Design a protein around this ligand. Structure first.
Ligand SMILES: Nc1ncnc2c1ncn2[C@@H]1O[C@H](COP(=O)(O)OP(=O)(O)O)[C@@H](O)[C@H]1O
Ligand SMILES: Nc1ncnc2c1ncn2[C@@H]1O[C@H](COP(=O)(O)OP(=O)(O)O)[C@@H](O)[C@H]1O
Ligand SMILES: Nc1ncnc2c1ncn2[C@@H]1O[C@H](COP(=O)(O)OP(=O)(O)O)[C@@H](O)[C@H]1O
Ligand SMILES: [Mg+2]
Ligand SMILES: [Mg+2]
Ligand SMILES: [Mg+2]
Lengths: 548, 538, 541
């Protein structure tokens, strides 16, 4: 009576092991645990979304509104939350787009599931309700698609793709951020129209260089790569033009050393007198063949000895240090060169072409300019990013990567397949699934009708973060979808969407004029990952933890 | 009397030790009670390191979670060894051992000696073996029926996952075991089928591949990614910096000799490269359309990668040791260690060779073989635990189907084997059996303990286990006098019985034979243990 | 496999409770635990027994060989020992003799049962074996009594009763200690031709007043009582007054006051002058009537005021405090008076007679001597002990208390008779119990044969404490009973014990018949309880 039996036969497992089952409201506590981190990403959704500050154990601060980036530094405890954390990371890797949608959609499916479980629906019937409704959802997305990108590169068409993607990440000015990204994409495209070749694109081609100081309006696009380096012998503006011939050596420049027990052997004083002048003639003979080929610049991958740097300054040859690997690998893609390990005379067919190499002060340090020109086009262009704070420079770099990942979506599928933006995609699916829930007899219609209710979070979040009442604005939007379709074709009511601030009362007319659209390839995997993320949580009847 | 032998010691005997084996096995079975069945619960394990293990397999629960009770350690080692040989029966043995101890514990309280109880277990188990010969159904492999392998594979798939992943993985496992069957009739499970974890798309997109896939790819850009006709050359020798034997080294007299001795490092590397070039001179016919690839077991010196780039030769380094043994089954060639003796006969053949670069890792795909002797299964998953959940689901389905092709017989599932033993052991005359007197009671405890598994299946469906088995016993009564032989199963969807042969529910032959034999020895040794003590020098 | 299940019953009851049950321990284990205290009593048995020093938490040292006294001051955690301790306490309270026999006999009955339980004999049939053997033992003790005596009066008749008891305790003194008790019993018994109807006798008639210093041989017997007090007011008159009347007053001597608290109330000064002489003449009126009756001694238990002591000093009347009430009734039995709580005047019938009173120092401290010669005393006496150490005289007082306890056990029933001692009776009981088992066949024969084996410890203890071999003298003792003269064979303690036979009638060493009957019944029941307890339940602390 004084002390409990304290769960007899609990010694079967260690004291750190705990058992949590769907019974005793733990499945409700798991859903309630999602709402703790769900509201964190709700205020970050949309162009008006609010960025968040997360301080790790090392002191590094990353300010971003991206749900996939924020969940990386956070330490997660509840097991089912890690299902939602790792679900948003896959969306950022695969499509590089729609990361905040997976976080919000998978969290709302569990919120509407709390009412489904309370009514007595078993975990098996709830899973079957979302799987049957998702298959109908993916089929309706292909029916509601409007327009296409058609040609790969265009000045105007790239403003209907990258611009609406970067509008949510560091909104700021529209045309300023869109022109910087759209310029670097046109350089890495092989073009070659009418040739019938298979298009190709690399997401790691475009590199963002973070340089503090200045302003965003002072940023520009550089066709070549930009590094922070100090030339050893001399700096040269290379105003003599006629371009240049450049060679890249992944191996360092120095006398070849034996990998085992390199040692100087001198038997008599006769060999010692010629040992000092012998090493000078070796580098002279090797570097003379390079200078005879007209090579004004040499890219090195490791430390170069001083004896080798002497003869390079004699013929006026620049010296570049390219540490590690990936930094040197993208240099040859600019000039179209093939590295070779030997120090001998390079092949003229493997030599690159760079017209000018400049060194100027940007952020207070000397940077080398690899920028290319109109002719002899180059690939893997870099974008100089100027900013006052380094925290803004980090997320804009990820904001540009979101626009670069959107270019990848123009390659694998048949086209761009633009979808109505401003939340009009998830709203139209509500009326279609509602009709689909009635067409299915049985008890499975409860999970299907509530599956469309979870799509109401997109219009409510965009309206709440915009400073508008969700009770006045949201029902007024259904008035366009409540009139269904008339006796005549050509219905433009599908372009209605949610507006930020301004005059409210729905607004922005038809979004076709606003030019903001969504990607179909992004919405395909965004719904599949978010559904499986909530399905995994609902499919687990018992959760076991260790040590805590 | 132990306190006099040791200053500090802990011991429990007789009724204190009798509650050890009964209660500890009751708590362990309760954890796996909700596991048994296709509708069973799904458990996730999260350790202190942050790893996540999500599976329905009872073996992962025992290995990841430590057990302080020594009674369950004997059961955990028995349930683990059951999945090792037979690939199935982990949660079955736990339910058999835990229940048989409780069914025999009621008579121990009545004053019946444990030995005469355990003696009845052997008498009742030997009858399950004699009945097993007439219970099993013979299947001839000369028919090569594909539908039979589909229904057997779905037995283990529907338990671990739902019908979504079952329909996808059903033809994959069947196509994997199809190449296992050969005129030699020998079945080798490890080399024929593998599990390769890669995160791509969704777990439901898992597809089957008819040729070996590797985790490595071409390092040099000019290496052709897609090669129509490639001749695979097996090389187990590594071209790279060697141990050098205590590093003796070079000594040069003049600077001209310093670079002259440095060229000796490439003398041994280029010596083996000239043999590969001479081998390419035989296959040089139709060089643009065809190709030549090299797969090495050990890392290759990046200094020599530029040699294969000029000749458009794909090089693969740091390959697994087991992958070297499968290159003869996939391509059809032979293995070559020394490059001195080379022949076109040992070269393999492939109809399609391509590489798909996803992220930083690059994978090489090989398929379209004339007469491939082996295949692979590429496991795709969304998350780290999703790769392990499919790994445990497919691997457990491998031993289930592989054991079918070993023998000519197959055992129907759906609890038809456990219900048949109940009517057999209870209605059998004891004069035919070697057990008499109080040993007759021990047989009844073994027959009643076998009816909990078909009742455990119903506990996960929500129906009353007592009411659903009332219609099963009533069907078997009129089936004997109607001159009709039919096996009655348990259908959890409608809460009624069914026929495992018509529904397609089948169980492996080696699983149930080793489970009952294994579970009997565990429970017998626990009932015969009257004392549990702990002593040692630490 | 690292941690034990801890059992489900761990949550039941509490962690402080400990359990000893059948097959769980005890079962000749706990019997081996009392062997440590059993060996303690074996060395203290007999005239050669060894005394044991015990220091209580208070610091008082009690040196004695009595098992009832030793086990009383020892704190013993083992519960089943208290069954044997409380068994020895009954022997001291009722009979007062045989405390060492009860602890030794009951301890051996549990030792001989070690072989019985080892053979698979259940404790249920063991209890029935000792019960039927105990009834046969008490019936055979009557035919072995050659010492039946109808006197219980003459001093020489007590040499076969009191003296054998004194022979065991403080064996260094025989005729000195026996004369002190025998003379004290002769004084407390009334002188008459024939005294029947079992005249009353109590242990309060003989007392022991221990005085430090002096040899034990210098001790004597005093018919009165010796108390340590300070006389006041005058020196005694010796024999000049001859027999003087002594008045014992329960209430103190002072002007009678109410139980409630009073105070003096004086309205005028006229009563103040008479207040000084008022209290003087008020108490003098009651003190004057006492001197007219010839009362030379007044005993008031409570404190006597100075106003009452003033008058009694000039008349030559003795005043003695006697603070303790228990010793107050003892002085009344010396003179034969009636304690009077009232003051009043002494009546002749209620006053006693004392021959003489003197104040002397026996050990250097002044004490008052109540010795009365030629006078009539009823059930009163004392024994003055003289010794160098206080601890040695402690067991001597217990030896005297055990000597007078035999007189109480002799006088109260029809009689205690006599039994042959020095291992003579214990060997004769072995042949009786052994032959009794063969008369009735059954499973009880195992418990009957082992019941006679436990009787071998008493005769060999006398040989063991004498430095003799129990494999020679003891086996040769059984051959001496082969056949009156065969019932008088016993154990010899001497350098002449090599023959192993000494006649008991020479030294006249006898034991009481009623003492052995009461000792066996308690020892058998004590050993029966240990075997009848299947489970032991302990508690925290
Ligand atoms: N100015 C705007 N007006 C209306 N809707 C907008 C505007 N800017 C963005 N949106 C909508 O807000 C959504 C935000 O998408 P988001 O989840 O941020 O994508 P990601 O996570 O990949 O950055 C977009 O789908 C877009 O349709
Ligand atoms: N869909 C089903 N319907 C009826 N019975 C099933 C079904 N799936 C499995 N079972 C039964 O459950 C038992 C255990 O199957 P399984 O889980 O594969 O082995 P284990 O429990 O040893 O891991 C089998 O004997 C089988 O008869
Ligand atoms: N001088 C002696 N010679 C031989 N035996 C003696 C002598 N003095 C005592 N004994 C024996 O020693 C025994 C001591 O027994 P004791 O402990 O006094 O019995 P109890 O416990 O009844 O008092 C007596 O039975 C007596 O026969
Ligand atoms: Mg976006
Ligand atoms: Mg299985
Ligand atoms: Mg005595």
């Amino acid at each position: 009576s004084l002390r409990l039996p304290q769960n007899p036969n609990a010694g079967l497992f260690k004291q750190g092991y705990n058992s949590y089952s769907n019974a005793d409201g733990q499945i409700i506590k798991s859903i309630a645990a999602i709402r703790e981190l769900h509201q964190m990403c709700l205020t970050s959704m949309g162009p008006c979304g609010r960025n968040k500050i997360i301080v790790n154990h090392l002191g590094k601060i990353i300010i971003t509104n991206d749900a996939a980036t924020m969940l990386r530094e956070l330490d997660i405890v509840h097991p089912a939350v890690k299902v939602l954390v790792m679900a948003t990371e896959q969306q950022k890797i695969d499509m590089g787009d729609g990361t905040n949608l997976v976080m919000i959609l998978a969290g709302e499916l569990l919120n509407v599931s709390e009412k489904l479980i309370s009514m007595g629906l078993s975990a098996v019937e709830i899973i079957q309700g979302y799987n049957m409704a998702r298959k109908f959802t993916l089929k309706e997305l292909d029916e509601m698609v409007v327009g296409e990108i058609t040609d790969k590169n265009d000045k105007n068409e790239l403003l209907k793709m990258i611009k609406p993607v970067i509008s949510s990440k560091k909104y700021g000015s529209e045309d300023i951020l869109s022109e910087l990204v759209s310029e670097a994409v046109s350089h890495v495209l092989p073009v070659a129209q009418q040739a019938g070749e298979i298009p190709y694109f690399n997401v790691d081609s475009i590199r963002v260089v973070k340089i503090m100081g200045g302003s965003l309006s002072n940023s520009t696009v550089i066709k070549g790569m930009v590094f922070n380096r100090e030339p050893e012998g001399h700096v040269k503006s290379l105003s003599e033009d006629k371009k240049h011939k450049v060679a890249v050596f992944t191996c360092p420049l120095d006398i070849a050393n034996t990998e085992t027990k390199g040692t100087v052997l001198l038997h008599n004083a006769q060999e010692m007198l010629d040992f000092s002048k012998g090493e000078e003639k070796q580098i002279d003979a090797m570097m003379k063949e390079i200078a005879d080929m007209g090579v004004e610049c040499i890219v090195a991958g490791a430390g170069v000895g001083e004896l080798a740097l002497h003869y390079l300054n004699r013929y006026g040859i620049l010296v570049l240090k390219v540490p590690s690997k990936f930094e040197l690998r993208r240099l040859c893609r600019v000039c179209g060169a093939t590295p070779l390990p030997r120090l001998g005379a390079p092949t003229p067919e493997e030599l690159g072409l760079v017209e000018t190499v400049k060194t100027m002060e940007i952020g207070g340090d000397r940077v080398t300019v690899f920028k290319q020109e109109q002719g002899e086009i180059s690939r893997t262009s870099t974008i100089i990013l100027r900013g006052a704070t380094q925290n803004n420079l980090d997320d804009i770099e990820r904001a540009i990567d979101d626009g670069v990942a959107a270019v990848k979506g123009l390659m694998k599928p048949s086209g761009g397949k633009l979808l109505p933006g401003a939340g009009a995609t998830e709203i139209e699916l509500i009326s279609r699934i509602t009709k689909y829930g009635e067409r299915t007899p049985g008890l499975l219609q409860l999970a299907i009708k509530q599956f469309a209710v979870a799509f109401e979070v997109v219009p409510r979040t965009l309206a709440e973060t915009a400073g508008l009442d969700v009770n006045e604005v949201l029902p007024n939007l259904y008035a366009a979808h409540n009139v269904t379709e008339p006796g005549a074709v050509k219905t433009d009511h599908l372009y209605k969407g949610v507006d930020i601030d301004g005059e409210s009362d729905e607004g922005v007319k038809d979004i076709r004029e606003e030019n903001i659209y969504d990607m179909l390839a992004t919405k395909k995997f965004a719904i599949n990952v978010a559904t499986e993320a909530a399905t995994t949580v609902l499919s687990i009847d018992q959760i076991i933890m260790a040590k805590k | 009397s132990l306190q006099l032998l040791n200053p500090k010691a802990e011991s429990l005997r007789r009724d204190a030790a009798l509650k050890v084996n009964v209660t500890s096995a009751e708590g362990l079975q309760s954890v796996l009670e909700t596991n048994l069945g296709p509708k069973g619960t799904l458990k996730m394990l999260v350790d202190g390191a942050g790893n996540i293990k999500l599976t329905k397999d009872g073996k992962v629960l025992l290995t990841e979670m430590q057990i302080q009770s020594p009674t369950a350690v004997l059961i955990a080692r028995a349930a683990a060894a059951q999945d090792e040989i037979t690939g199935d029966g982990t949660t079955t043995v736990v339910c058999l051992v835990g229940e048989l101890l409780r069914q025999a514990h009621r008579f121990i309280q009545e004053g019946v000696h444990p030995r005469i109880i355990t003696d009845g277990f052997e008498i009742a188990r030997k009858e399950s073996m004699k009945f097993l010969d007439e219970f099993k159904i013979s299947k001839t492999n000369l028919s090569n029926d594909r539908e039979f392998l589909l229904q057997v594979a779905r037995s283990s798939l529907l338990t671990k996952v739902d019908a979504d992943l079952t329909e996808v993985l059903t033809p994959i496992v069947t196509d994997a075991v199809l190449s296992v069957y050969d005129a030699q009739a020998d079945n080798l499970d490890l080399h024929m089928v593998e599990i390769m974890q890669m995160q791509h798309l969704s777990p439901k997109d898992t597809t089957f591949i008819k040729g070996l896939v590797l985790d490595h790819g071409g390092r040099h850009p000019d290496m052709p990614t897609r090669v129509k006709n490639a001749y695979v050359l097996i090389l187990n020798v590594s071209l790279e910096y060697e141990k050098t034997e205590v590093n003796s080294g070079f000594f040069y007299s003049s600077a001209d000799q310093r670079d002259k001795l440095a060229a000796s490092e490439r003398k041994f590397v280029d010596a083996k490269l000239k043999k590969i070039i001479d081998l390419k001179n035989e296959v040089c016919g139709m060089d643009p359309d065809k190709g030549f690839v090299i797969i090495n077991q050990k890392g290759i010196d990046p200094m020599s990668l530029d040699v294969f780039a000029k000749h458009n030769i794909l090089a693969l380094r740091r390959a697994k040791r087991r992958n070297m043994e499968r290159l003869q089954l996939v391509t059809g060639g032979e293995a070559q260690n020394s490059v001195e003796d080379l022949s076109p006969q040992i070269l393999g053949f492939s109809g399609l060779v391509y590489q798909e670069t996803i992220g930083e890792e690059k994978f090489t795909y090989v398929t379209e073989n004339t007469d491939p002797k082996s295949c692979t299964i590429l496991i795709k998953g969304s998350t780290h635990y999703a790769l392990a959940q499919t790994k445990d689901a497919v691997r457990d389905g491998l031993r289930a189907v592989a054991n079918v092709l070993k023998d000519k017989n197959i055992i129907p599932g759906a609890g038809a084997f456990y219900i048949a033993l109940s009517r057999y052991l209870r209605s059998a005359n004891m004069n035919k059996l070697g057990a008499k007197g109080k040993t007759k009671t021990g047989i009844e405890a073994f027959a009643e303990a076998l009816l909990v598994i078909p009742k455990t299946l119903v506990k996960n469906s929500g129906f009353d286990p007592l009411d659903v088995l009332a219609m099963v016993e009533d069907e078997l009564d009129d089936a004997q006098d109607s001159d009709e032989t039919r096996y009655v199963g348990v259908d959890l969807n409608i809460g009624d019985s069914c026929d495992p042969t018509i529904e397609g529910i089948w169980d492996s032959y080696r699983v149930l034979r080793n489970a009952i034999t294994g579970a009997t020895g565990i429970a017998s040794n626990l009932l015969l243990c009257d004392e549990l003590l702990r002593a040692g020098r630490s």
